[PDB]
Ligand binder design. Structure first.
Ligand code: SRM
Ligand code: SF4
Ligand SMILES: [K+]
Length: 456
């Protein structure tokens, strides 16, 4: 279990070949596991720092996790600057000791693919005339909970205000230090930023950040999100460039009988002009493909089974690693997701909603790595084969789903969804998401203030 610092999930084709080699020859599993934080993991390492350092990669006292950045913006030209900033914040935050681990993102509306509400500090990019002018700052997200411990809770980030580009690093540093100083000095399970904010208050925390940064926040600049999914397939970039996002189930890159996913990515890496981008949805973008090269790349991806069509449901589902490698796993996640979505796909077809999707996530234990606490339908592992079923989040990921059923099995989960999906298929308003529908139709009460109303 070794993880690399890879801001924005951008990795070169050279770096890819290096990690592909190591993964194959020096680990028990032989796989490359793309994570939902835009980096990769090796499992069962049997020097790695030299191998990493040799291609210019460094694995993260340092409570800082990988800084995320919207991987495939609709306004393609914005990525370069946003990525440059994610990278600078990353280097800037590198060693103070944080009470708990600190997570940061750079978001480019209208996409919340990085799932900002699961993070401590978020910089939402504001652009004027194709140029970034500043960031809206949202602080305090965190999903980790402890079963039956009403003192823990998932929380969404709070808006602090807008800041011109020039103040970015000063503000980033100020949030980190304020949290470091005010974080709970006694208990580890309450030292996270989401808890500090609720203890001292957003305005109190905010005022301190302004004092330390040497700035005064301006009012929030308008922004909205329309989704969190990747743009599977070919999308037109800038110039004559194209981006091919490949759906990779569970982000597990391995050669399977008749689906040489790993070798395929190696073949592509060898002829690929630009680089790759690991997404927050555990997928991979082959970025900067000249129009003339599309066919070459597509042929390989197609042959290798990297372009096998899946339903929109499968593309919008996610699970954490869990067993067999995670020591904290309570129930299967990555290994349960595939057949579970086979079941959900059947249910979607049965109700005539096969072209629809429900943001569905499974996390193997309450730590919440699979980000089930920001899903429309979240499954939270409680024991072997048993999960807590949560409903009521929304497509864009700005609402925490309340627990609907507790410690139930797959057959029980499937029966409840069969029924709920049916009602949604028939009673929903035009373009209404499943999560919103369960809340509208009174199937589940919404979570309006997590620190106070998440638990029944
Ligand atoms: C690989 C990854 C899951 C995935 O399927 O993509 C994952 C995997 C693990 N996470 Fe996580 N976490 C990962 C994203 C997150 C997220 C979601 C996110 O950041 O977008 C969360 C929820 C958000 C949050 O932090 O509140 C998350 C909250 C945790 C926690 C609980 C943190 C807390 O504040 O209490 C732990 C346990 C701990 O650190 O104590 C943890 C622990 C772990 C460990 C490293 C278990 C351990 O401590 O020994 C898991 C490794 C399993 C394995 O065998 O590989 N992981 N984990 C995601 C790796 C991110 C990365 O590259 O660093
Ligand atoms: S949610 Fe739990 S089981 Fe899943 S990877 Fe994180 S710590 Fe392990
Ligand atoms: K995926």
């Amino acid at each position: 279990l070794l993880r690399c610092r890879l801001p924005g999930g951008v990795i070169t084709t050279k770096q890819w070949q290096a990690i592909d080699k190591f993964a194959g020859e020096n680990t028990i599993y032989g796989s490359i596991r793309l994570t939902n934080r835009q980096t990769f993991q090796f499992h069962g390492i049997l020097p790695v720092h030299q191998m990493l350092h040799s291609v210019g990669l460094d694995a993260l006292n340092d409570m800082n996790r990988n800084v995320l950045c919207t991987s495939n913006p609709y306004e393609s030209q914005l990525h370069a600057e946003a990525y440059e900033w994610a990278k600078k914040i990353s280097e800037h935050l590198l060693p103070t000791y944080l009470p708990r681990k600190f997570k940061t993102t750079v978001v480019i509306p209208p996409q919340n693919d990085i799932d900002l509400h699961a993070n401590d500090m978020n910089f939402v990019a504001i652009a004027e005339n194709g140029k970034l002018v500043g960031f809206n700052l949202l602080v305090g997200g965190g999903l980790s909970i402890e079963h039956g411990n009403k003192k823990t809770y998932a929380r969404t980030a709070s808006e602090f205000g807008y800041l011109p580009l020039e103040h970015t690093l000063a503000v980033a540093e100020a949030v980190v230090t304020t949290q470091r100083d005010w974080g709970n000095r006694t208990d580890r399970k309450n030292a996270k930023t989401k808890y500090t904010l609720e203890r001292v208050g957003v305005e109190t925390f905010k005022a301190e950040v302004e004092r330390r940064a040497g700035i005064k926040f301006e009012p929030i600049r308008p922004y909205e999100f329309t989704g969190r999914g990747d743009r599977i397939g070919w999308v037109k970039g800038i110039d004559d460039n194209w981006h091919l996002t490949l759906f990779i189930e569970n982000g597990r890159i391995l050669d399977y009988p008749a689906r040489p996913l790993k070798t395929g990515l190696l073949e592509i890496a060898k002829i690929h002009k630009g680089d790759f981008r690991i997404t927050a949805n555990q997928n991979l973008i082959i970025a900067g493909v000249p129009e003339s090269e599309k066919a070459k790349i597509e042929k390989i991806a197609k042959e290798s089974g990297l372009m096998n069509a899946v339903t929109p449901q499968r593309e919008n589902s996610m699970a954490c690693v869990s067993f067999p490698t995670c020591p904290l796993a309570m129930a299967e996640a990555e290994r349960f997701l595939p057949s579970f979505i086979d079941n959900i796909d059947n249910l979607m077809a049965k109700h005539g909603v096969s072209d629809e999707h429900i943001v569905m996530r499974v996390t193997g234990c309450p730590n919440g790595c699979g980000r089930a606490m920001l899903a429309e339908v979240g499954l939270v592992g409680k024991a072997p084969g048993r999960y807590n079923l949560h409903l009521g989040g929304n497509r864009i990921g700005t609402r925490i789903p309340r627990m609907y059923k507790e410690n139930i099995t797959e057959p029980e989960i499937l029966a409840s969804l069969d029924e709920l999906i049916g009602r949604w298929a028939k009673e929903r308003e035009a373009g209404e998401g499943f999560g919103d529908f369960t809340v509208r139709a009174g199937i589940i009460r919404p979570v309006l203030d997590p620190a106070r109303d998440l638990w029944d």
